[PDB]
């Protein structure tokens with residue numbers, strides 16, 4: 167029941183009750199999470215998104231981003247509202263027509279307008295590799311081995327009151343889970359395995375906010391992929407996974423036939439597992455249909471530590487092996503005050519004209535681009551370093567860059583940089599007070615690429631900038647279809663702009 171790589175995708179409003187509490191939602195494909203969009207490496211995806219939304223309480227406009235797909239030459243298809251497009255208006259559709267050369271792994275898709283993805287528009291996106299170098303490590307890799315972790319709110323995203331703390335009401339694993347308060351014994355998700363087989367579990371955080379401590383009682387997990395990047399095998403018994411990150415891990419069904427708890431503990435909201443919150447069930451074929459009776463350890467033996475991960479391929483680190491050893495070394499001042507985030511003193515507020523359209527219309531330095539102070543130019547064919555020192559309230563903040571993955575030269579909670587063999591990924595926790603998480607990449611993808619915290623509430627409150635990569639070559643690199651050119655006039659007419 168995967169769809170794609172050529173598919174329609176309808177975006178609708180409907181009631182759902184994933185934790186036993188009914189609320190309206192914004193759904194792709196009629197479900198929460200949305201259906202898996204899938205294809206093979208190098209395929210042409212043609213996702214015709216039909217905006218059928220009618221309930222203004224969750225916004226009737228929409229725009230969808232394909233998280234972690236580089237969009238080289240198709241920046242117009244990337245999805246962030248007012249960065250690469252105007253939103254699609256209700257009653258209209260738009261074909262996101264792009265290719266995925268050179269990428270294979272676990273991705274996801276989500277609304278990229280306001281906080282709308284929190285209201286339900288989120289689903290997995292898998293690019294399989296027919297020649298996967300990890301293929302011999304497992305037996306099963308299909309829709310039944312995708313594990314999504316989601317935060318779910320009873321209050322609608324647009325209706326979260328100004329000045330009150332926002333926390334979720336349930337953790338949903340594969341779309342099901344129990345509410346933290348007024349808990350009812352609603353159905354839990356079941357992941358089924360066969361004794362003796364090995365599974366490529368594709369763990370996807372579709373969170374709007376919390377990080378999760380993910381584990382499976384009785385089992386360990388051998389990581390083989392990080393945010394689309396193949397890794398050396400790393401065996402862990404717990405994974406702290408931040409918003410928008412992905413891991414593949416091998417699960418060996420090597421425990422007695424039975425039922426085992428799957429645990430996903432968020433860093434906010436309900437703590438523990440009373441009443442079966444924060445839980446799903448791993449069930450072996452032939453086990454009794456009953457809840458697990460297993461317990462977690464008090465202390466995990468082998469938690470994931472990001473510096474333990476290393477690429478499977480020889481990826482190295484671009485630039486020179488010291489701080490500032492790049493063509494364009496940056497240090498961002500990431501701050502929060504009075505309800506707003508800022509980057510180098512500027513809080514992001516989406517512009518009226520999308521950044522890409524401003525560039526195509528001839529704005530040719532980043533000082534000319536709106537929002538003023540929110541768009542930073544990057545030079546072409548250059549090594550970029552971005553230090554992201556933590557400290558701003560609401561952390562740990564998982565920062566994400568569109569259009570690129572990056573070497574994680576320095577990780578959370580460890581002052582030592584790695585210029586030899588760090589993991590590459592696309593979303594990274596910047597850690598805690600005093601940390602200096604630092605990323606590097608090379609600029610080989612002209613266009614405006616969003617850089618932001620992936621806690622959606624923080625993005626909405628301004629925690630973002632746009633890297634206008636290679637402004638001079640953006641128009642030649644990214645020819646735009648007529649339907650894209652039609653988006654802003656249609657949107658602005660509908661909204662009387």
Ligand SMILES: *[C@@H]1O[C@H](CO)[C@@H](O[C@@H]2O[C@H](CO)[C@@H](O[C@@H]3O[C@H](CO)[C@@H](O)[C@H](O)[C@@H]3O)[C@H](O)[C@H]2NC(C)=O)[C@H](O)[C@H]1NC(C)=O
Pocket residue numbers: 471473474580581582583584585
């Ligand atoms: C904090 O982060 C640093 C940097 O990522 C980590 O340092 C790295 O630690 C590894 C593991 O010990 C070192 O690699 C090892 O190298 C030795 C040669 O001495 C080799 O025999 C081992 O097989 C292994 O590959 C690596 O050199 C080192 N890198 C740097 C730049 O120091 C460190 O482990 C992290 N701290 C914690 C507590 O995890």
Ligand SMILES: *[C@@H]1O[C@H](CO)[C@@H](O[C@@H]2O[C@H](CO)[C@@H](O)[C@H](O)[C@H]2NC(C)=O)[C@H](O)[C@H]1NC(C)=O
Pocket residue numbers: 489490495496497553555600601602604
């Ligand atoms: C994080 O690392 C960056 C460099 O990647 C540090 O930046 C330097 O900051 C000092 C002032 O604090 C400046 O004088 C230098 O010009 C900067 N660049 C260098 C040395 O390459 C930054 O200080 C670090 N931040 C934290 C909090 O550790």
Ligand SMILES: [Cu+2]
Pocket residue numbers: 231233234276410620
């Ligand atoms: Cu994303």
Ligand SMILES: [Cu+2]
Pocket residue numbers: 231232233234566567568569
């Ligand atoms: Cu993205």
Ligand SMILES: [Cu+2]
Pocket residue numbers: 560561562563564619620621624625629
């Ligand atoms: Cu944040």
Ligand SMILES: [Cu+2]
Pocket residue numbers: 231246278568616618
């Ligand atoms: Cu984004």
Ligand SMILES: [F-]
Pocket residue numbers: 232233234235567568569592
């Ligand atoms: F992305």
